[PDB]
Write a protein that binds this ligand. Structure first.
Ligand SMILES: O=C1C=CC(=O)c2c(O)cccc21
Ligand SMILES: O=C1C=CC(=O)c2c(O)cccc21
Ligand SMILES: O=C1C=CC(=O)c2c(O)cccc21
Ligand SMILES: [Cl-]
Ligand SMILES: [Zn+2]
Length: 472
């Protein structure tokens, strides 16, 4: 067919890197009357984005036509898919015209298409480089109306543009957004927040009289750990890099941070999403069978990721480390409940006979579920800990794609409250590291003192740095 030739020839044009040939083949198809489908359009947008814009004379027809091709795709009502948005975005990034990036997003919306987060990036980061705060806030308002949630890079851009234009109101609001959506901040956002609090504008914003009643009312109302009523106090901020002790006490100022509740209704929603997500990947009958088993067992104070407890920091599966963990979890259980061990059936059948007999004893005591061949254990230990409302014992770093499906609002908060990690020393052996008695999140106290935590990969490996910003 003629459409299958365009497909065949554009495939090679990208793989060569010839944009001029892809643009010739584009026009030939219009002069031949051949309709372009999803696939054809995506390859052109990608191919066009291999071009750069000229430092000397007007930009090259690869990028210029790229946007025209995109505009035409939308006009034609060719359905965009995830490769469309990626390509249109990398076209916008190479072009580096924030104004034109923002047009694509406006077209998408005009034609009933839901823009992606990566669509907004070129516009937002361009306007930020340029210092055009008003345009950045336009892009932001457009995301909000499109219900596309920013992540940390977009929020940091918004923060920095707000700092650049002395807009203390936007700094405040953006800081609350970081609290709400990100919780702990990257190193570059952390440095940026420190600069804000040390700056003249920050020194010069505030109020020395305020209604203590309305603040306290706002603290109750927000769920705790913030009030949202604006900057309080006056004068220079004391801004110190510091740490929290194990009880959430700031080492600089002695403020004890608060522990923020989780709403049990959000937990039930999450439980249902786990079930849905798991059923999509596991054999449905396997996950059902586990849920039915779980309904007939328990109660549990803890759930163990048995593969991770056998393997973390080991050359091969350590039954010693699994068993030591089981024993320690049982010892801290107020009634000495055995923890529920989730482990692959292949690993249940350990080749030292007393260990195999113990694994079978645990099963017989209602405290071991052997997951079937082909299963991903993670769904099982997550579903169990969530549903049994108990501790989850795993050092899984949660780098896997699976965990990205769980979202970045509820699940990180839940994890903080439920996750136990093991650590081992030469001197002392194995230790359980329990959930902290405070929430590791940006906090704003009732007198307007701020504590801002840095994000780290593992906070047992890394001593987590915090900012303490307190009026002098
Ligand atoms: O000042 C900047 C504001 C936003 C932004 O994205 C940016 C950047 O990406 C590189 C240098 C400076 C800035
Ligand atoms: O949609 C489902 C996927 C898995 C699963 O176990 C399940 C279930 O157990 C009950 C209703 C729906 C589902
Ligand atoms: O006292 C606690 C405050 C917060 C919190 O998350 C917590 C916890 O997760 C386990 C025991 C005590 C606390
Ligand atoms: Cl033995
Ligand atoms: Zn402090």
């Amino acid at each position: 067919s003629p459409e299958a030739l365009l497909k065949q020839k554009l495939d090679m044009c990208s793989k060569k890197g010839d944009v001029l040939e892809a643009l010739r083949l584009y026009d030939e198809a219009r002069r031949n009357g051949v309709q372009l489908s999803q696939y054809h359009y995506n390859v052109l947008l990608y191919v066009c984005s291999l071009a750069e814009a000229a430092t000397e004379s007007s930009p090259n027809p690869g990028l210029s036509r790229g946007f025209d091709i995109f505009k035409q795709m939308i006009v034609d009502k060719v359905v965009p898919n995830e490769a469309t948005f990626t390509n249109g975005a990398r076209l916008a990034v190479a072009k580096d015209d924030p104004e034109m990036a923002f047009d694509m997003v406006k077209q998408m919306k005009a034609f009933g298409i839901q823009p992606r987060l990566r669509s907004y990036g070129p516009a937002l980061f361009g306007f930020c480089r340029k210092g055009d705060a008003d345009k950045a806030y336009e892009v932001d308002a457009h995301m909000v109306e499109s219900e596309v949630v920013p992540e940390e890079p977009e929020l940091a851009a918004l923060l920095k543009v707000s700092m650049d234009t002395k807009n203390a109101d936007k700094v405040y609001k953006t800081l609350q957004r970081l609290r709400d959506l990100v919780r702990q901040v990257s190193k570059s956002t952390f440095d940026m927040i420190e600069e804000w609090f040390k700056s003249e504008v920050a020194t010069k914003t505030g109020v020395k009289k305020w209604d203590v009643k309305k603040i306290r009312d706002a603290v109750v109302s927000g769920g705790g750990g913030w009030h949202g009523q604006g900057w309080l106090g006056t004068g220079k901020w004391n801004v110190k890099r510091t740490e929290m002790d194990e009880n959430g006490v700031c080492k600089c100022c002695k403020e004890k941070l608060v522990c923020i509740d989780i709403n049990p209704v959000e937990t039930e929603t999450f439980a249902a999403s786990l079930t849905r997500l798991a059923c999509e990947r596991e054999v449905k009958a396997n996950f059902n069978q586990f849920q039915e088993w779980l309904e007939r067992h328990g109660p549990f104070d803890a759930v163990i990721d048995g593969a991770n407890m056998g393997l973390v920091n080991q050359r091969s599966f350590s039954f010693f480390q699994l068993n030591n963990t089981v024993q320690r979890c049982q010892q801290i259980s107020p009634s000495k409940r055995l923890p529920l061990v989730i482990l692959h059936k292949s690993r249940v059948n350990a080749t030292y006979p007393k260990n195999r007999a113990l694994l079978e004893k645990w099963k017989n005591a209602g405290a071991l579920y052997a997951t079937p061949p082909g299963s991903n254990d993670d769904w099982y230990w997550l579903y169990a800990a969530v549903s049994c409302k108990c501790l989850l014992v795993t050092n899984d770093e949660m780098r896997d794609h699976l965990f990205q499906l769980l979202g970045n609002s509820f699940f990180p908060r839940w994890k903080e409250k439920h996750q136990v990690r093991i650590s081992v020393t030469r001197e002392d052996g194995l230790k359980l590291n329990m959930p902290p008695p405070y929430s590791i999140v940006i906090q704003e106290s009732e007198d307007g003192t701020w504590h801002v935590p840095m994000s780290v990969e593992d906070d047992l490996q890394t001593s987590r740095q915090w900012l303490c910003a307190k009026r002098s």
